[model samples]
Target: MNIFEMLRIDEGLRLKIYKDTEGYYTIGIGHLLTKSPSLNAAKSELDKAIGRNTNGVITKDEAEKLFNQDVDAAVRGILRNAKLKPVYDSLDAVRRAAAINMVFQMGETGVAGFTNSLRMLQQKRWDEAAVNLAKSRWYNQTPNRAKRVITTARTGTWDAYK
Candidate 1:
């Protein structure tokens, strides 16, 4: 199967591989679904949840605002995308999600744009990049949680981290 299929895009999941009506593609996750109380909802409901989190905005600029405002989700998205790319080589499912979550929380340009982090990641220095990830003080108020995630990813315990 293709990478998109591996990510399991489906009607009920709202995990579309291609860009959606909002002109933004799924980061290959339904974070709301993953962490939401109503786990058995339909695709439409998934769309609605995204809309609500996004404040009913569809434009990329507005969607960016949601990422900007909700640091955690943004960081999550960033890590997710990075884990899937060649620069990171490979990641287990949980690690991939954690990467996206961290990246999302840190913003696209924040962690993904960090020169040292990118260099370490490109060099496949998983431990070092993860260290940088843990030490990063972007959203300085929450150290333990972010550090836990980085530690989990570094130790290959990302599945349990979630």
Candidate 2:
């Protein structure tokens, strides 16, 4: 019903801080602790929220706020790349979301390393681009998620993966 619910469905909640599948120390709902300062900030925020001095947890509401901010930043990261400009501009909304999701899951630098995938995307080779995306270490690491992303990348349909 809300963006928070949507993100909860996509990214399961973890009240306590933990390492994610990618080995990043994460908290709440997929909130990555990519930097020391950010991690410290999260810890501080959690401590304040729970009125404690120890490492604390975030509520669902807090997780939702973090997810919204992270998603916004990821979208900006995708848009700022001149190399990704064409894909960002030309793809349909769903496909654009898929691309942005990739940029979010993998950092801009990681997505930039998808040379063949980016080449296929730039050339508008939908199926090939999807295949290229599928045949990656990322895909190997998370097949179902990769399939969903690839399906959306190829079809530009929200239900493709479903």
Candidate 3:
């Protein structure tokens, strides 16, 4: 129900396609067009998102629709990741949200490298999981989100970041 709590952290919407901090063609809610299967695929999706030719403008509602689709894919991505499916499954809603939040920001492969943290999370070592997470480069880049996600993992409380 409170998915928007994590959603707040992921949202940095842009109607136009622009180079992200890492210099990828991104649009809407951090959607990396470069990550799409092909330029044509990205083009098609962008057209759908804007409901017009790819003049690169999208409405808030359009962005919301893309964001919802991306979030759904993120969750399903976690389930398909052999390393993460079990780790993700071994949590309450709050803790699972923490994992999904991570997966949302980074792709499944990006999060799949968090073997130590994943193991700790799977073993119910909440604090240990947080500790491992805090030591990552993700922590340095997005410390505020890392702090909130780590807090949620450590506390396993839906409102821990509140």
Candidate 4:
């Protein structure tokens, strides 16, 4: 019943350090290991979270903790955004999960930029919203993941994740 199950499929967890598609150091359900101001500070936090020198190995316990933190921030970001809050509250569970999945990948601002699509979602125009969602650089960046989320938005079903 956890929506993160759906999100997890798209994210594909890893316990060791790896380069994301954009070449950022990432680990544990897409947690970018670098900070904007100081990579050293972020590395320090990572070490603290994993309770070690890292050595490119993050335990599953720490991974879930980081994943939960990311998810909490994503949800809070969605709730705080003026444009997205109403639309998100109006959506069905599966559709809402799809939105969270999107927000998890990009920030809340990125998801809110789908203005017309959000309107379509608000109006319950599922297919139209899905079509609009498909017409983006995001879709171009990760077609498979976008398709699944878009399909969930269209059908309001868990089938896409399955």
lDDT per residue for candidate 2 within 73-158, as digits (tens), equals 87788788877766678777777777777777788888878888888876789988887788889999988777877887788776
lDDT of each: 0.46, 0.73, 0.79, 0.84
**Candidate 2 residue-wise lDDT at 6:** 36
lDDT of 4 by residue, 125-152 (tens): 9888888889999999889988988998
TM-score to true structure, per model: 0.43, 0.81, 0.83, 0.89
Question: After superposing candidate 4, which stretches have Cα over 4 Å from the reference?
Answer: 35-42, 48-52
User: Distance from true position, residue 40, model 4, in Å?
Assistant: 6.1
The best candidate in terms of TM-score: 4
lDDT of 2 at 8: 54
Write candidate 3's Cα lDDT for 66-102 as tens digits: 7888889989999998999998887888888888888
Ranked by TM-score from best down, the candidates are: 4, 3, 2, 1
Clashes in predicted model 4: 0
Q: Give the top-scoring candidate (lDDT).
A: 4
Residue 30 alpha-carbon offset, candidate 4, angstroms: 1.4
* Candidate 1: tens digits of C-alpha lDDT, residues 68-140: 4444545344546653354444555545555555554444666555677666655667799877765556435
Clashing pairs in 4: none
| Model 3, TM vs. native | 0.83
